[PDB]
């Protein structure tokens, strides 16, 4: 009554976008260590039961297309969906290799009215990115 039904053939798909190298046009540097992160995340998520796929150095159009397409699959026998984004970011946007795209645009594909086979099922987005340039100095 109070938990999401997990009795499905599949936990679900996990898409990992691992953006390491960026076009000079964008001004952004290489993200060292991100392959190590993506690998560790791939293992954890696979270990939870997700069908994990990892896509590397995606353009903005590629990222949008991946999620659109995923949103168009039949998730009838999946409990949930996850996406993990590893990249540079600024507030409300994330970098592809060729520029920025709005985080909300990537997620909107999964909305109730647009992806009926995930209706009432969790849609999880894990987002590893800058979100502006403020530094937390800490205290005590």
């Amino acid at each position: 009554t109070y938990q999401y039904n997990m009795n499905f053939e599949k936990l679900g798909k996990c898409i990992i976008i691992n953006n390491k190298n960026f076009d000079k046009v964008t001004g952004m540097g290489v993200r060292n260590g991100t392959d190590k992160d993506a690998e560790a995340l791939f293992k954890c998520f696979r270990s939870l039961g997700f069908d994990v796929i990892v896509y590397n150095d995606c353009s903005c159009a590629k990222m949008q297309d991946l999620l659109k397409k995923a949103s168009e699959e039949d998730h009838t026998n999946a409990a949930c969906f996850a996406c993990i984004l590893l990249s540079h970011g600024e507030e409300n946007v994330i970098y592809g290799k060729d520029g920025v795209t709005p985080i909300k645009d990537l997620t909107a594909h999964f909305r109730g009215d647009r992806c009926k086979t995930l209706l009432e099922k969790p849609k999880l987005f894990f987002i590893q990115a800058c979100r502006g340039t403020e530094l937390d100095d800490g205290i005590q």
């Binding site: 995340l41 939870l48 909305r111 969790p122 590893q128 990115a129 800058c130 100095d137």
Partner: protein, 92 residues
């Protein structure tokens, strides 16, 4: 009838307006912590318990080092946004 925005969760590595840190040589702080907690507890804790532990691990275990005072000894806190309508366990 279900709201179109319901049943999303966003787990951000940092709060809005803020930088996100990586330790020299060993990848992003939020990722380290998320992997470390999921590997220990991904199958026995609810998603918010997991992410809350991640919040604590990032907040405590980590602190930046740097020869520029402007980047020295900084901290980070992740940010969970939940529109979930039930508890989420990865099992059963």
């Amino acid at each position: 009838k279900i709201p179109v925005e319901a049943d999303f969760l966003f787990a951000y590595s940092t709060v809005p307006g803020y930088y996100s840190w990586r330790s020299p040589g060993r990848g992003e702080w939020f990722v380290q912590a998320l992997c470390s907690i999921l590997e220990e507890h991904g199958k026995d804790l609810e998603i918010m318990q997991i992410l809350t532990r991640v919040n604590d691990r990032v907040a405590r275990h980590f602190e930046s080092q740097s020869d520029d005072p402007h980047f020295h000894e900084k901290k980070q806190i992740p940010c969970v946004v939940s529109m979930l309508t039930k508890e989420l366990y990865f099992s059963q």
